[PDB]
C-alpha cells in the first residue's frame, strides 16, 4: 500500500508532531464532576503548571462514562485553540482516559519489532501497568522511542516513511502511518485519539514498526 511521505508535511506540522510525541500529559488518580459542551471533561488546575485541563471526547457517552470517576490520563497535550473554561490558561488533550483502579502488580512488557528499509534492527520494549490501556498511550510510547533513536520527526533525518502496526490477539488490528498527520496544528494532529480507544493490555501480541529512508 502507499504510505505518506515526510516531504508532504510543512515544517510546522513536523515540529508539532515532534512536540506532541515528546511531551505528553501523564497523571494518575484525578476526577472531574464537570462537563463542558456535552463532550469534554474539565479538571481545574490539574494540568501542567496548574493550568486547567480540558479532556475532549468524541461523544457525550464517553464524557458521561468518566464523569465522577478516579481516572488516569496519558495523552498528547496542546495549547493553541484550546478553548478556555475560566481565566486561567487552558491545556487540552483528546481521550487518553482510563479507570485508576484497574491495575496490574508488575508492568506488562510489549515487544516492538523494528525494521529499517526491510532490515531487522533491535527489538524495542514498551511497558504498562494498566489492565486496560489507551491505544494513544501505547502509540506515544512507540513514537517517543522512534523519535529518540531514529529521528522520525526531524526534517533532515533520513527517515521518510513509517508504519506502526499493533498485531492483536483479537481479530481487529490497529496501525498508524507516522507521516499521515490530519493537519498541521496540534488540535488537528491529536484528534485521531478522540474515540478514547482502549485495549486490554494482554490482548496485544506485539508491535511491528517499519521505517523507510528516502533514500
Amino acid at each position, epitope marked *: 500500500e502507499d504510505l505518506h511521505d515526510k516531504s508532504e508535511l510543512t*515544517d*510546522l506540522a*513536523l*515540529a*508539532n508532531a*515532534y*512536540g506532541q510525541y*515528546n*511531551h505528553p500529559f501523564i497523571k494518575e488518580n484525578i476526577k472531574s464532576d464537570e462537563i463542558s459542551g456535552e463532550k469534554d471533561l474539565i479538571f481545574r488546575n490539574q494540568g501542567d*503548571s496548574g493550568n486547567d485541563l480540558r479532556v475532549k471526547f468524541a461523544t457525550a457517552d464517553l464524557a458521561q462514562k468518566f464523569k465522577n470517576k478516579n481516572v488516569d490520563i496519558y495523552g498528547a*497535550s*496542546f*495549547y*493553541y485553540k*484550546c478553548e478556555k473554561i475560566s481565566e486561567n*490558561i487552558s491545556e487540552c488533550l483528546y481521550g487518553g482516559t482510563t479507570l485508576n483502579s484497574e491495575k496490574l502488580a508488575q508492568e506488562r512488557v510489549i515487544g516492538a519489532n523494528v525494521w529499517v528499509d526491510g532490515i531487522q534492527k533491535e527489538t524495542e520494549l514498551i511497558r504498562t501497568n494498566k489492565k486496560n490501556v489507551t491505544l494513544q498511550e501505547l502509540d506515544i510510547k512507540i513514537r517517543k522511542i522512534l523519535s529518540d533513536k531514529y529521528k522520525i520527526y*526531524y*526534517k*533532515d533525518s533520513e527517515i521518510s516513511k513509517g508504519l506502526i502496526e499493533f498485531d492483536m490477539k483479537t481479530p481487529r488490528d490497529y496501525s498508524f502511518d507516522i507521516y499521515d498527520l490530519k493537519g498541521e*496544528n*496540534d488540535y488537528e494532529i491529536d484528534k485521531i485519539y478522540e474515540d478514547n480507544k482502549t485495549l486490554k493490555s494482554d490482548d496485544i501480541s506485539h508491535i511491528d514498526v517499519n521505517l523507510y529512508t528516502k533514500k
Partner: T-cell receptor
Amino acid sequence: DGGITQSPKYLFRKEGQNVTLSCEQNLNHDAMYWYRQDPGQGLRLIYYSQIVNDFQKGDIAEGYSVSREKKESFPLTVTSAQKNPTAFYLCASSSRSSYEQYFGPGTRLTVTE
Amino acid sequence: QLLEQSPQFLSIQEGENLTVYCNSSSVFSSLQWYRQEPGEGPVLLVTVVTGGEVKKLKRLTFQFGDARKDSSLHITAAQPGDTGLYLCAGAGSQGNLIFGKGTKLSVKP
C-alpha cells in the same frame, strides 16, 4: 545533583603561544559546545560535539581545535593561527544535541603581540 | 537560520512592566531564554516546547507563539536586580542552538 565548570577564570598569553581551555561536566550530558562572545556579535559557536569521540566545526572554527575522548570533558585549544584570540570563552552542555544548554562560568583570554 | 530580538537595549524605571520579543521565519521545536551578567555564564530561565505555551515563573511570563516562530518574555514590576542581557535561543537543525543577539536590560532604582 551536578554542574559544568571551566578553568581558569583569566588567561594571558603572548601572541603565537597555543593554549588549551578546560570544560568539565558531570551532568551526564552527551553534547558539549564552545562559544566566543565579542561585544558586537554576541555568542558565536566555535566547535561542538554531539556525543563522545564525535565533534564538528561551528561557524568560526578557524584557528581552533578540539577533542572528545571522554563524555565529561571538551577541551578547546586556541592556536597561533587564530588571529583575534582575545575573547570571553563559554562552554555549554546539553542532554542531547539541540536541547536546552547549561553554561559554564566562562574564561577570559587576552593575547597581546 | 536566524533569531531576531527586540528591543536591543531597554532602560526602564523600577516598577514598570516591559516585554521583550524574539522572532524568526524558521519553526522551532523548543525555545530557551537566558539571563547573563557581564563576564559570567548565561543562566537558563525557561524552555518552552509547545506552540502557544505560556509559562509563569514569579514576575516573568514566557510565551511560545502559536506557529512556533516567536516567543516573548514579559516582566512585571521590574526590579534593579533584573538588569542583565536577556538571550533567546532556539533548537537548531544541526544538533545546535540558534541564539538571538539579546535585549540588554537596565532597570533604574
